């Protein structure tokens, strides 16, 4: 129901 | 009937009302 | 340039519908077309019509003579003894081409009266007034009339237009092609308590003189095709969007709060699609209708979308919010690029399907994150390589057979198999991602904005198609607009991935030369398989060495096999320094497993998925473990999970367990690591030291600190440990002991997870977690040890299975009194009873599933019960159950259920062509040939499903089991 | 290759000649551990001259 992709740890910028 | 009795499946006339609607709200 | 295949040009069409009778399932109406002949001596005018009884036709208020014949009603003659499928496919393609409006043809042939020939030679207007009647439609308009008494608005009866592609001929006579654009005037005289939703904007709503009926007048000034015109008449609850005020949402009665919560996100979808493209939404209104017994889950017409009510959820329902959200998003993407910009031929359909799927993927990227985007792209690519290696290949943009490796003709959308249609849309959006890879994303959005801007300057003119054909896109126009905005042409990429119909297969293996410090890759292609083709372009490879991550481009010509790339130092093993990753960060790695002589940690062939490929790389197991742990790409973590199943060493168990414990890993990687850890644990029995896999980890993550066997009370507010918590016992139940039976330590753990479940404290529902608990109980069932075919009775039941059977009986009976959101526990319990019947535990009796597959049940229960009956008639070779299923295909009220029964009977067939079965009569061949020929003549999706079933059962040649 | 058994403290003596000799591409082709090294066949007799200083 939300983002749930830990994007700040895989693509930090 | 004594061991594992199942309530028989009855058809609804409008099944989305008993499926989709929340009962505790 | 667009030149019409029709000798006339249609300007305006009036569709008036009166007397919608719900008791008799009947509509009456007329249709008035305004055509301009482009060639003199027009004589006959050929229109499209199915199922409508044509009463009278008047051309310019003069009585004209029409003749009707539909060759697609009975495709081959009844007295032809042919029984091969290639004959039927050619005859069906010829029959569909004989009613095709994309040629000059059509089903209703009207003869122009003689006195109008001096009006038609000097090219002046003709106004054709047909009045018709649908007596009891088997297609097109679907009447959902419940059997509660009361008025038709009090019982909840409604009509909606169903079908796919050009299926508007099924409810009024038209020119049912996507290339005949005209303006529209739509009047519907419905009951006073009902509302009629259609395309355009509602100009007025007048009462009738008795005030018992009212007429809805719609006008559509944007020139759309007849195939984009829809209708939904019912007692709908109206809800104006509180954010965007031209958007109205219609639901069935008593479902207004679900509609309020569900359609509350749609303004963000509107804002996204209007800011990546720079055109505003082209239509003046937007209407979302939610209905019962829908054809597809989401249909998109001009200025209107028709969804099923099964998408409506409340605020406390998770695991359904993203699915409904993305259904709304792809309906809006098709509003932009399937309904406003239309198709010039049946070729150039890949352009529209690709642009719709590509901008919907951009929406998914922004909304759910880049990691969910990469996971979705990888699952679509795996889907297409599985389908294309299975059967032939999908050919985007064929030239008119061009694809003769497959049992249907690809000249028309209504002869395609449904799986081919799904894979067509899937491959179209992946090829559009490839065009974005060659020509950057901002130039791609500029292409789409140029197409939309040409269409919207075209959409406001009044000239009858002098300029209205700029709203139709083609392949040559799309490539020319790409070449206009970028200066590069993509003709090699178009020639390889569109015109050629194949995917590539890569087999890679490396060797590190220590002397010259090089990495010798060895990439060979399998190009002799039936689905494959040969790749000769460039190929990116990413090598992670101790000095960092380096990309290399390899030129893979036909005679190429060995590619020597250079390697860097190994001075980050001399000092302990951090090894820099693919992104800017750097981590501490345990280099004890690495080779002493090689610096390279892992290799990835084609990391960005820049070709339609299937890679089979041969790394070492420590390289797969390093790629699972320290990679910053989710598709590489998924492929390392997939490749670690072949290496059951305890270092791989440590790698997957460290992935499972790790938050800030993407959650769908941990959900895969559960099943990979279960498979590895099953393979290293008689070596496993401590408890079963993931149990201690479950008690560490999700149970109480003071009580290890009592689970914590449910708080599902994190949405990543909720998914991991509901997927971990399902994988944990696939554990097996040395005796091939599930251990009683994991089964007891699952039963204690079921008993101590308390959900009185979270703001979310528990139906999916409990349904997954039933799925975990079903996974633990091993086949029973029947002796001398002993009858399975209650006393000789397994002591393990009696607890499982008690739990699923309790769950199903409690669902009968307190139902779940979409009867998810009914579906899970029916699936588990079929699991217990598939092994020798419960008697193999289909009567329970036959009672759950009746008409009055919810559609998820129906398809689960019918899946159980299809599995039963495959295993027990039942003749009467197959006749039951074929009868249910012939006469069921819901056509989605008929399509699903044909689909499930194709996926899990009762016999294949190789098998000798008792169910290989001439009677079954005659029944299925009659089902292809007649019987399925009203749907275009049941007929392709019957063709698929006949192909799966009897093959392309003459049925063998025949005189 | 040519298996050569040596001393752990003497293994790095042949590695310094690898980074100094410009005859071939690389002297040591595979360094097994601390008491086993490999070599293109040609420098055992030449190494015997360096024993006077070792």
DSSP notation for C319-334: SSHHHHHHHHHHHHHH
- Report the alpha-carbon distance of residue C549 to residue C774 in Å, rounded: 45
DSSP notation for C652-688: HHHHHHHHHT-BTB-HHHHHHHHHHHHHHHHHTTTT-
User: For A10, which residue in chain C has the nearest alpha carbon?
Assistant: C632
Q: Which of C152, C293, C763, C856 to mutate to test the interface with B (most CBs of B within 10 A)?
A: C856
Contacts of B6 in chain C (CB under 8 A): 809, 812-813, 848
Chain B interface residues (partner C, CB cutoff 8 A): 3-23, 25
Q: How close does chain C come to B8, measured CA to CA in Å?
A: 8
3-state secondary structure of C209: coil
The angle subtended at Cα C331 by Cα C326 and Cα C337, nearest 5°, is: 125
- DSSP alpha helices (H): ranges in C73-199? 85-98, 117-120, 152-155
Quick check: C515 and D26 CB within 8 A? yes
Quick check: D31 and C516 CB within 8 A? no
Instruction: Return the residue matching tokens 């190009």.
Output: C527
- Kindly list the distances between the CA atom of residue C735 and the CA atoms of C682, C700, C755, C757, C780, in Å, as whole numbers in the listed order: 6, 19, 21, 23, 8
CB contact at 8 A, C288 and C247: yes
Q: How close does chain C come to A7, measured CA to CA in Å?
A: 7
- Report the alpha-carbon distance of residue C232 to residue C197 in Å, rounded: 5
Q: Do chains C and B touch (3 or more CB pairs under 8 A)?
A: yes
Give the resolution in Å: 5.8
In three-state form (DSSP H/G/I as H, E/B as E, the rest C), the secondary structure along C558-586 is CCCCEEEEECCCCCCCCCCCCEECCCCCE
> In degrees to the nearest 10, what's the CA dihedral of C854, C855, C858, C863?
60
Quick check: C583 and A1 CB within 8 A? no
Residue B10's Cβ-count burial label (10 Å; 0-12, 13-18, 19+) is exposed
- Number of other residues whose CB lies within 10 A of the CB of residue C818: 9
Contacts of D30 in chain C (CB under 8 A): 514, 597
Contacts of C596 in chain D (CB under 8 A): 31
Quick check: C855 and B11 CB within 8 A? yes
Residues 6+ apart with CB under 8 A from C502: C388, C393, C531, C532, C533
- CATH for D1-54, among 3.40.605.10, 3.40.190.10, 3.90.660.10, 3.30.70.1220? 3.30.70.1220
Residues 6+ apart with CB under 8 A from A4: C368, C369, C372, C667, C719, C720
Q: Name the C residues in 369-408 with CB < 8 Å from any B CB.
A: none
Contacts of A2 in chain C (CB under 8 A): 719
CB contact at 8 A, C340 and C258: no
- DSSP alpha helices (H): ranges in C391-474? 418-438, 441-458
Among residues C105, C39, C111, C109, which one has the least CA distance to residue C69? Answer: C109
CB contact at 8 A, C241 and C328: no
**Chains sharing 3 or more CB pairs under 8 A with chain A:** C
Q: How close does chain D come to C615, measured CA to CA in Å?
A: 30
- Report the alpha-carbon distance of residue C830 to residue C847 in Å, rounded: 12
Contacts of C368 in chain A (CB under 8 A): 3-5
User: For C373, which residue in chain A has the nearest alpha carbon?
Assistant: A5
Among residues C461, C446, C477, which one has the least CA distance to residue C342? Answer: C477
> Could you say which of C515, C596, C597 has the minimum Cβ distance to residue D25?
C515
Among residues C368, C361, C262, C374, which one has the least CA distance to residue C311? Answer: C262
Residues 6+ apart with CB under 8 A from A8: none
CB contact at 8 A, C156 and C252: yes
Instruction: Return the residue matching tokens 């297609």.
Output: C139
Is the CB of residue C487 less than 8 Å away from at least one CB of chain A? no
Residues 6+ apart with CB under 8 A from C860: B19, C310, C822, C823, C824, C826, C827
Residue B25's Cβ-count burial label (10 Å; 0-12, 13-18, 19+) is exposed
Quick check: C584 and A10 CB within 8 A? no
Quick check: C514 and D25 CB within 8 A? no
Q: How close does chain A come to C518, measured CA to CA in Å?
A: 29
- DSSP alpha helices (H): ranges in C111-195? 117-120, 152-155
Instruction: Return the residue matching tokens 């001596």.
Output: C41
Contacts of C322 in chain A (CB under 8 A): 1
Q: Which two tokens stand for residue C39?
A: 């060639």
Residues 6+ apart with CB under 8 A from C228: C178, C199, C301, C302, C339, C342
Pair type for strands C195-198 and C108-111: unpaired
CB contact at 8 A, C303 and C197: no
Is the CB of residue C817 less than 8 Å away from at least one CB of chain B? yes
Beta strands in C334-404 (DSSP E): 342-343
CB contact at 8 A, C103 and C175: no
Q: How close does chain D come to C570, measured CA to CA in Å?
A: 14
- Number of other residues whose CB lies within 10 A of the CB of residue C909: 15
- The enclosing H or E element of B2 equals none
Residues 6+ apart with CB under 8 A from C421: C413
User: For B16, which residue in chain C has the nearest alpha carbon?
Assistant: C858
- Resolved by: cryo-EM
Quick check: B7 and C816 CB within 8 A? yes
- DSSP alpha helices (H): ranges in C527-569? none
Quick check: C597 and D31 CB within 8 A? yes
CB contact at 8 A, C284 and C303: yes
Looking at residue C339, the DSSP 8-state letter turns out to be I
Q: Which two tokens stand for residue C825?
A: 């526990």
3-state secondary structure of C512: strand
3-state secondary structure of C438: helix
Q: Is the dihedral of CA C851, C855, C857, C862 positive or negative?
A: positive
């Amino acid at each position: 129901p939300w983002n749930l992709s830990n994007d700040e740890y895989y693509y930090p910028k | 009937v004594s061991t594992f009795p199942l309530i028989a499946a009855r058809p609804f006339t409008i099944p989305y009302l008993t499926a989709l609607l929340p009962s505790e709200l | 340039g667009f030149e019409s295949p029709r000798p006339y040009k249609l300007t305006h069409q009036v569709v008036c519908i009166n007397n919608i009778n719900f008791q008799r399932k009947s509509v009456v109406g007329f249709v008035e077309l305004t055509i301009f002949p482009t060639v003199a001596n027009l004589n006959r005018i050929k229109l499209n019509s199915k199922q409508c009884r044509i009463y009278r036709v008047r051309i310019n208020d003069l009585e004209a003579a029409f003749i009707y014949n539909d060759p697609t009603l009975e495709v081959c003659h009844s007295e032809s003894k042919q029984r091969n499928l290639n004959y039927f496919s050619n005859a069906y393609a010829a029959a569909v081409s004989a009613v095709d409006p994309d040629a000059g043809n059509g089903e209703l042939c009207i003869k122009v009266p003689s006195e109008l020939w001096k009006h038609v030679d000097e090219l002046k207007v003709l106004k054709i007034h047909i009045n018709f009647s649908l007596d009891q439609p088997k297609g097109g308009l679907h009447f959902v009339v419940p059997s509660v008494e009361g008025s038709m608005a009090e019982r909840g009866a409604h009509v909606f237009s169903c079908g796919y592609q050009n299926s508007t001929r099924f409810w009024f006579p038209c020119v049912d092609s996507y290339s005949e654009l005209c303006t529209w005037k739509l009047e519907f005289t419905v009951d006073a308590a009902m509302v009629a939703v259609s395309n355009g904007d509602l100009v007025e709503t007048v009462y009738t003189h008795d005030m018992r009926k009212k007429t809805f007048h719609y006008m559509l000034t944007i020139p759309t095709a007849a195939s984009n015109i829809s209708l939904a008449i019912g007692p709908f609850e109206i809800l104006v969007d509180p954010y965007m005020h031209e958007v109205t949402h219609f639901c069935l009665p008593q479902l207004l709060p679900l509609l309020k919560h569900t359609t509350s996100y749609l303004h963000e979808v509107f804002e996204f699609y209007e800011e990546i493209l720079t055109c505003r939404y082209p239509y003046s209104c937007f209407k979302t209708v939610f209905i019962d017994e829908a054809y597809v889950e989401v249909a998109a017409y001009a200025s209107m979308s028709i969804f099923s009510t099964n998408l409506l959820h409340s605020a406390m329902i998770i695991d359904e919010t993203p699915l409904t959200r993305r259904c709304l998003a792809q309906s809006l993407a098709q509003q932009f690029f399937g309904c406003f910009i239309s198709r010039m031929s049946w070729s150039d359909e890949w352009v529209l399907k690709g642009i719709s799927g590509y901008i919907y993927g951009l929406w998914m990227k922004k909304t759910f994150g880049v990691n969910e985007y990469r996971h979705w792209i990888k699952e679509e690519l795996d889907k297409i390589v599985a389908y294309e290696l299975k059967t032939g290949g999908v050919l985007l943009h064929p030239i008119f057979n061009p694809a003769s490796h497959l049992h249907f003709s690809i000249k028309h959308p209504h002869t395609l198999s449904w799986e081919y249609y799904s894979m067509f849309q899937c491959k179209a959006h992946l090829v559009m991602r490839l065009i974005e890879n060659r020509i950057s994303m901002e130039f791609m959005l500029q292409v789409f904005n140029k197409l939309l801007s040409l269409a919207s300057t075209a959409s406001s003119q009044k000239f009858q198609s002098h300029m209205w054909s700029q709203m139709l896109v083609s392949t040559s126009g799309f490539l020319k607009s790409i070449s206009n905005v970028s200066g590069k042409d993509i003709q090699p990429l178009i020639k390889q991935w569109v015109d050629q119909s194949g995917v590539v297969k890569f087999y890679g293996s490396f060797a590190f030369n220590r002397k010259r410090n090089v990495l010798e890759l060895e990439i060979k292609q399998d190009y002799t398989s039936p689905g494959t083709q040969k790749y000769v372009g460039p190929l990116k490879v990413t090598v992670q060495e101790l000095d960092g991550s380096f990309n290399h481009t390899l030129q893979i010509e036909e005679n190429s096999l060995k590619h020597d790339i250079p390697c860097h130092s190994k001075s980050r093993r001399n000092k302990k320094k951090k090894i820099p990753l693919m992104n800017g960060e750097e981590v501490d790695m345990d280099l004890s497993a690495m080779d002493a002589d090689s610096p390279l940690l892992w290799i990835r062939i084609d990391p960005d998925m820049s070709v339609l490929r299937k890679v089979e790389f041969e790394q070492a197991d420590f390289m797969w473990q390093y790629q699972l742990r320290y990679e910053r790409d989710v598709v590489a973590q998924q492929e390392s999970i997939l490749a670690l199943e072949k290496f059951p060493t305890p270092a791989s168990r440590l790698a997957l367990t460290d992935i499972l414990e790790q938050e800030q890993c993407f959650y769908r990687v941990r959900m895969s690591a559960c099943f990979c850890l279960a498979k590895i644990a099953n393979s290293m029995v008689s070596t496993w030291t401590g408890p079963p896999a993931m149990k201690s980890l479950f008690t560490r993550m999700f149970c109480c600190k003071s009580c290890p066997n009592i689970v914590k009370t449910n708080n599902f507010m994190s949405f990543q440990s909720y998914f991991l918590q509901k997927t971990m016992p399902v994988a944990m139940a696939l554990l097996r002991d040395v005796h091939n039976l599930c251990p009683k330590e994991v089964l007891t753990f699952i039963l204690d997870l079921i008993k101590y479940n308390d959900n009185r404290k979270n703001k979310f529902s528990d139906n999916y977690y409990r349904a997954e608990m039933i799925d975990a109980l079903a996974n633990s069932v091993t086949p029973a040890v029947s002796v001398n075919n002993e009858v399975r009775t209650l006393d000789n039941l397994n002591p393990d299975v009696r607890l499982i059977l008690e739990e699923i009986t309790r769950f199903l009976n409690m669902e009968k009194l307190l139902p779940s959101y979409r009867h998810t526990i009914t579906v899970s319990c029916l699936r588990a009873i079929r699991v217990l019947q598939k092994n020798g535990h419960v008697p193999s009796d289909p009567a329970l599933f036959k009672s759950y597959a009746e008409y009055g049940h919810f559609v998820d229960i129906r398809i689960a019960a019918l899946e159980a009956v299809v599995d039963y008639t495959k295993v027990d070779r039942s003749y009467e159950e197959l006749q039951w299923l074929l009868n249910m295909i012939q006469n069921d009220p819901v056509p989605y259920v008929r399509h699903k029964i044909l689909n499930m009977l194709t996926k899990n067939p009762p016999f294949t062509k190789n098998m000798e079965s008792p169910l290989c009569n001439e009677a079954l061949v005659d029944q299925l040939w009659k089902l292809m020929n007649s019987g399925t003549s009203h749907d275009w999706r049941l007929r392709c499903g019957a063709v698929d079933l006949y192909f799966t059962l009897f093959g392309l040649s003459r049925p063998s089991c025949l005189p | 290759g040519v298996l050569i058994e040596c001393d752990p403290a003497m293994k790095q003596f042949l590695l310094y000649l690898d980074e100094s000799n410009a005859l071939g591409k690389k002297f040591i082709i595979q360094d097994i551990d601390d008491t086993h090294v490999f070599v293109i066949a040609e420098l055992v007799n030449v190494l015997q001259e360096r024993v006077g200083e070792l």
